[PDB]
Amino acid sequence: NFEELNSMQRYSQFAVFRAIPGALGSDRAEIVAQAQSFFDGLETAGKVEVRGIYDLAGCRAEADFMIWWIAEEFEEIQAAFARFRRETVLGQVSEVAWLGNSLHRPAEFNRSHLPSFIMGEIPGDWITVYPFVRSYDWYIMDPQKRRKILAEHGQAARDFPDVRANTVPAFALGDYEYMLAFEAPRLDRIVDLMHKMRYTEARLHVREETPFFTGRRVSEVSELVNVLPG
Amino acid sequence: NFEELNSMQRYSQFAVFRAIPGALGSDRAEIVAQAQSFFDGLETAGKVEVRGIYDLAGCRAEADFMIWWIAEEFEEIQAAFARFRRETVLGQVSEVAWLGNSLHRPAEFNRSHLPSFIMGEIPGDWITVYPFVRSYDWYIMDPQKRRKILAEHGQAARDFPDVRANTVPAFALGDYEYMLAFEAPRLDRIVDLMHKMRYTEARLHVREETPFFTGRRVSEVSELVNVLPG
Amino acid sequence: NFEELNSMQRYSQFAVFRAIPGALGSDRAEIVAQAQSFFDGLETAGKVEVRGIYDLAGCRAEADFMIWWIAEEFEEIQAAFARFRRETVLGQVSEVAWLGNSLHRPAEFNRSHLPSFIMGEIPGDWITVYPFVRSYDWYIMDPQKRRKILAEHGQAARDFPDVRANTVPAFALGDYEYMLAFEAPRLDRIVDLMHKMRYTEARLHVREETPFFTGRRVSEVSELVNVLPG
Amino acid sequence: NFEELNSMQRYSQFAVFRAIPGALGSDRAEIVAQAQSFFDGLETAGKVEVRGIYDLAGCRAEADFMIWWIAEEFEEIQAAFARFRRETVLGQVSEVAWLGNSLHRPAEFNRSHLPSFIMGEIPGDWITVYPFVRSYDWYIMDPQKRRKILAEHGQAARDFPDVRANTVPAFALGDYEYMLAFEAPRLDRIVDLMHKMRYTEARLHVREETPFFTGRRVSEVSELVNVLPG
Amino acid sequence: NFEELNSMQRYSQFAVFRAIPGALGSDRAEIVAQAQSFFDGLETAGKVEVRGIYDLAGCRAEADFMIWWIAEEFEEIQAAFARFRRETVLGQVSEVAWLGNSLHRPAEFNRSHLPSFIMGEIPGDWITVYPFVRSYDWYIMDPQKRRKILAEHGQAARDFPDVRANTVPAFALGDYEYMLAFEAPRLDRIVDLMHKMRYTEARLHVREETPFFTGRRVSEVSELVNVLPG
Ligand code: FEC
Ligand code: FEC
Ligand code: FEC
Ligand code: FEC
Ligand code: FEC
């Protein structure tokens, strides 16, 4: 099944939204009821798996919450994404802020490196996601040297096994090359990990890694809706 | 044929639009029939060729659908684009997000390399479109050096003959040097072509290649109007 | 007369406007008349010369049409510019998208390179306008090296005598160094010229050259107002 | 006690807000009371410490005031932030401009350097806040060279002991690597510190340090509320 | 007195506003009366010196007029800037586009160089304003090499004594290092000065110098308010 985990087809999308001030109002029970119904429908249809919903309040301006859903076919995420904005009031009073799309593929050298979500691990309580673009010369570099740099890079994170990684290619799914998501039970551990990873030779082959989206996984839509601005 | 295909004048435009939340309303039957009537007119007139309409739902924020159409004269694309915005409710309740214009020309060295749309090939079910800007030294470079880089570049895509390429100059038709479009029966094949094309010396002569637009070709206007947000 | 031309004082402005969807409507005859009446008063006063009005439909998002007008003193352009927005409906229902200002000066080495509008040449049916910023090391370069670079640059355009050039300084009149406009009877002639001009050593001393505005010169106001979105 | 401060966990957020014209109005006695009462709540709950509220009028377009508050847990900053926008009129008539989050950590080589707020010092009357991002080769630089570079960096600031420094890591809490705040009783001593600090080898390892936020600490909510635009 | 001129403390701000179409209207007589009254109160108060009001119509999109005022303390500019926005109808129907703040300081090597406003010279009828940022290596450069580079810089400007300079530090007051303003009786003399300064070695140590704001000093508020779009 290790071969099946590498040959698996899974599209992953991070859908970031911002709240429109003055749109939600103070009465939100129907919005909550209609929204939880939509997600109940996704779950029983068995096609789009919602890994988490995250309260992004306080991370950045122009972003409030985010959905992380996965599916075998991208056209499934298109329809769920479209139906959310079209047939739910929460989707009609939310603006789309940023979309991070990716597709699982095996690693170039160490095929034991698999995304946390590919392996069915339990999602972390805290998350940070952001895109990634490598240097222009990265992929044509001597494969022996690139393999050496990626080994020092994996070895530099040995002290953070509580932080689960998700590196997923994103070519042609947007303006980026990879899509990154890191889950942990505590935010301060993610911060510490990013700091340590700066001490690697791979940092000399980086072109872009913004924007960042950092938030807490909520247990149910009501926990998130009731927080948003009015 | 290959000389007349190289010599023919064809302009090509990718018209990307963004839905205005709240403008479409829930009753769209008349809006669909009117839009279909507009496209049927273009066909019978036989001046502007619509290669495809694409649902971009979930690709990026601030974009929803796209029109790809072609004409021998550019002012006929101007008139169809302006008429679409002016005389159809769909175009009235849509916002222009981005325009990618190009004009067909023969390749520098290999004159058997022609866009898939120039060769009359059936359009693919999935598409990614993005503009392109080479490095400043690309064209003044030793011509035989460029020749060699483009040949290796071409060989790196030998295993993706199901992905059909459209590389069209765009000088002075916008902010870009080339308009790129790649169509295929499956989206995953485009992601993997882009990933493979990173292993080329030509990646050292790239200045810009965003924004990306990726979507699914719809069989009819109605299929698209229905997924858009109200 | 030749040194008389190099000594002239002329300011040139490209005023690009963007239509406000929903602000115009379908009864545009009076709007067209007040607009025509305004441009008649300018020519009557004989201080501001309108070289052409241009339909940019389909060129880029957030731009619809452009005015090119010239005057000996810049304050006369400010007046015509502010009166157009203040005292004509077409100006009250349009947004300023971009302004490109310049002031004619003689060339550094070749005093017989003069802008087309300074030579009084008939304006072209198709135009492309964009700003220009040279590399930081351009002007402190050896004058003889820079002189040779400009001479080879000029020679690369020998085969496009139907494309007339306006290369005008713009220092301190905005964010750029030069303002460029290229007039031709056919758009493809402008595209082919720019592609050819890439094969010059002058491309290694370039810092900026966007945004581009390309369009067709209209015979009369009505021709433009009837294309815009209602 | 320095060992206990280094090991302290403290989250810090700068919440920059911009006023909405025509939203606040002329009568504000009730907004200042509801607002003053909100901050009174945080005081009792003893979870979120407001280090200062700053009047940013005149610093930059699209920013008017700022809140600097600290919490042991970032979830507490999330709730406080979300409650302000949701449960006070001041937060409902303002929009979020920019957010600067950080987490206090011990320094690399000199463990006696601690943020001025970790030291419990008194907030300066004037402040400048801005993010920071080092060069890509900074942390993988030979540690002795970095130690020395930061030593010179420290000696170069001996002239300004009256400006208190807060340098806090910000990895994964946004688009930046560090969050910087500099507190002083006079604004001009901050300006001179930035000017003097330009003369350091550290400046050769900088990638980004904008946007800046500079303003005056207010002694109570009323005075800030009353300078804002109606 | 020159030593007092180098030791004098003076804050300078360029406050750029943007008219709101539809917000001014036609009957602007009480508007101008109220704005002239506010500026007259400023002169009587004697703390904030208005150096000029500038008509920026036609320079750039999204900018219409500019105020240049000076004060010994920056708190007094905050007060007038806020009071203008909050209490004068003009400030209420204008948007803040950009703010340029600086603080007068002595020159590094030649203390005879002083801004034109610090010496009390009559303001010029035309102006160009823009921020400036030097290269990262500029201040750590060998002082004698920077002394020589600045001396040649100054000598390049000798052909333009009619163009008066105001180069003022802007560290910590925004996103820039210097705030530049050049006043002259003719606009074409400002363009020719910029063009000539390009022939200097200091140009190899530049990072940012945009945006520009170029306009005409008006005699009285009335002269400007009548130009604005309704
Ligand atoms: C964080 C973070 C970034 C982005 C920040 C940065 O650039 O430092 C980051 C960047 C990337 C990027 C691109 C890739 C894509 C590969 C490439 O071709 O560039 C990429 C891919 C890989 N990462 Fe990665 N990462 N990464 C971790 C976290 C981060 N990683 C942690 C933790 C571990 C260690 C734990 C684990 O293996 O599960 C780890 C290891 C790997 C391995 C396997 C290592 C091995 O071969 O031994 C592969 C493959
Ligand atoms: C994808 C993709 C990109 C953008 C990504 C990248 O930059 O790597 C991409 C980039 C460019 C760019 C610019 C140009 C413009 C020419 C230049 O001066 O740069 C450009 C133009 C050409 N491409 Fe290109 N491409 N490209 C393919 C797909 C992609 N291509 C595939 C597939 C094939 C192979 C199959 C085909 O012939 O159709 C292929 C080959 C060519 C040939 C013919 C080479 C030959 O002599 O063999 C020419 C000419
Ligand atoms: C197109 C185009 C650009 C921008 C695109 C590019 O960078 O390739 C372009 C860029 C620039 C720029 C800056 C300048 C300003 C000079 C400098 O100091 O940078 C600038 C100025 C000059 N151009 Fe220029 N151009 N340019 C033509 C078209 C383009 N030109 C064509 C055509 C001809 C030849 C036809 C004619 O003169 O009628 C031509 C010749 C000149 C001459 C005369 C040289 C001579 O022959 O000795 C001068 C001076
Ligand atoms: C202002 C300013 C900047 C941003 C501008 C710049 O780039 O110059 C600035 C930049 C940074 C940055 C990143 C860091 C993060 C460390 C690193 O890995 O880069 C960073 C961190 C440190 N700074 Fe820093 N600064 N800084 C001061 C003010 C500024 N500082 C003043 C004042 C003093 C001296 C007074 C004091 O706080 O005790 C001072 C000293 C330190 C020390 C302790 C020095 C020592 O070991 O000798 C550390 C650690
Ligand atoms: C215009 C213009 C720019 C921006 C364009 C450019 O980058 O070339 C411009 C750029 C800068 C910049 C930064 C600084 C800040 C100092 C530094 O470290 O960069 C800066 C500061 C100085 N400027 Fe400057 N300028 N500048 C003039 C106009 C311009 N200047 C004119 C005119 C004169 C001629 C003096 C006169 O008024 O009598 C002149 C001379 C000086 C002197 C005096 C040097 C001396 O000792 O001889 C100092 C100090």
Residue numbers in the entry:
A (entry chain C), B (entry chain A), C (entry chain B), D (entry chain D), E (entry chain E): 6 to 235
From the article:
ChdCs are enzymes involved in the prokaryotic heme biosynthesis pathway mainly of monoderm bacteria, but some diderm or intermediate representatives also use this pathway. They catalyze the hydrogen peroxide–driven oxidative decarboxylation of iron coproporphyrin III (coproheme) to iron protoporphyrin IX (heme b). After initial oxidation of coproheme to Compound I (two-electron deficient reaction intermediate), a catalytic tyrosine radical is generated, which is completely essential for both decarboxylation reactions. Mechanistic studies revealed the order of decarboxylation and proved that propionate at position 2 (p2) is decarboxylated first.
In this study, we designed variants where another tyrosine is introduced at the site of p4 (W183Y). A tyrosine residue is introduced as a potential radical site at the position of p4 in the active site in CdChdC W183Y. Also, we succeeded in solving the crystal structure of the W183Y variant, which allows evaluating the steric restraints around the newly introduced tyrosine residue. The structures clearly show that the introduced amino acids occupy the positions of the respective residues in the wild-type protein. While the distance between Y135 and Cß-p2 is about 3.1 Å in the wild-type structure, the Y183 oxygen lies about 4.4 Å above the Cß of p4. Both single mutations leave the active site and the overall structure is unaffected. Introducing a second potential catalytic tyrosine in the W183Y variant, spectral features very similar to the wild-type protein are observable. While the characteristic shape of the CdChdC Soret maximum is slightly altered (393 nm with a less pronounced shoulder at 373 nm), the characteristic spectral shift of the Soret maximum upon addition of H2O2 is observed even to 406 nm. The introduction of another tyrosine in close proximity to the redox-active substrate leads to approximately 11% nitrosylation on Y183 and 50% radical formation on Y135. Compared to the wild-type protein this is even an increase in nitrosylated Y135, which can be explained by a hampered reaction and slight accumulation of Compound I* in the variant.
